[PDB]
From a paper:
Our Can f 1 (C118S) structure, hereafter Can f 1, has a higher resolution and contains one molecule per asymmetric unit. IgE antibodies to Can f 1 can be found in ∼70% of patients allergic to dog extract. While Can f 1 shows electron densities for most loops flanking beta-strands, some Fel d 7 loop regions are disordered: Arg44-Trp48, Glu122-Gln127, and Asn158-Glu160. While the calyx of Can f 1 is somewhat larger than that of Fel d 7, both have significantly more interior surface area and volume than other dog lipocalins such as Can f 2 (15), Can f 4 (16), and Can f 6 (17). Can f 1 (C118S) and wild type Can f 1 showed similar pattern of the percent fluorescence reduction (data not shown). Subsequent molecular dynamics simulations for 3 microseconds showed that the carboxylate of the ligands samples between the two positively charged residues (R101 and K131 for Can f 1; R102 and K132 for Fel d 7). The negative charge of the acid head group is neutralized by the positively charged environment of the calyx, either by R101/K131 or R102/K132 in Can f 1 or Fel d 7, respectively. Indeed, simulations with 2 oleate molecules confirmed that 2 oleates could remain bound for up to 3 μs to Can f 1, however 2 oleate molecules only stayed briefly bound to Fel d 7. For both Can f 1 and Fel d 7, approximately a 2:1 ratio of oleate to protein was measured. We identified that the Lys131 of Can f 1 (Lys 132 for Fel d 7) in the calyx is the critical residue for ligand binding.
Residue numbers in the entry: 27 to 171
The structure:
Amino acid sequence: DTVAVSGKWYLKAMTADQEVPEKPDSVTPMILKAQKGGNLEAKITMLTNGQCQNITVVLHKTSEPGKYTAYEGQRVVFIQPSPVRDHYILYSEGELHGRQIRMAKLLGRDPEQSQEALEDFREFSRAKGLNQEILELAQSETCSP
C-alpha cells in the first residue's frame, strides 16, 4: 500500500475540526517517497507570508494497510483510495503541536480538478465530523526545490 501511494501528488483540498491559522498562498507538489522498511516520507513546500517553508513528515507503517503513525506516535494518518481513480484521501487524528486536531486531505495525481473527487471528499469529511469550510489549495512551482 505504501508503494501504491508513492510518488508525486497535488494536495487539492484540506479541512479540519479546528481553526488552522496558517493558510498557505500556494503549495508545491506533495512527494510521497516509499522508504526501505515500509515507512513513507511526505515532502511539500509552502509559500506563506513571502517565504518558502519546506515541510517533511515521516509516516510510520502499521499492520493495517493505509494506516500510519506520525509525530513520535502521537498522531495516526489513514491513507485510502478515493472512489475516483488517481485520487487518494488522507485522514489524520491526534496530537499536532500539543493540541488534538483532526484533518482530512484530498490528493490527486493530475492538476485537473475533479468535481466528483471533491464531492466525494466533502461527503467523506462530513462523515468524519469535519464540518468547517473546505480549503482548496493553489498549485504552483514557486518555492520548489
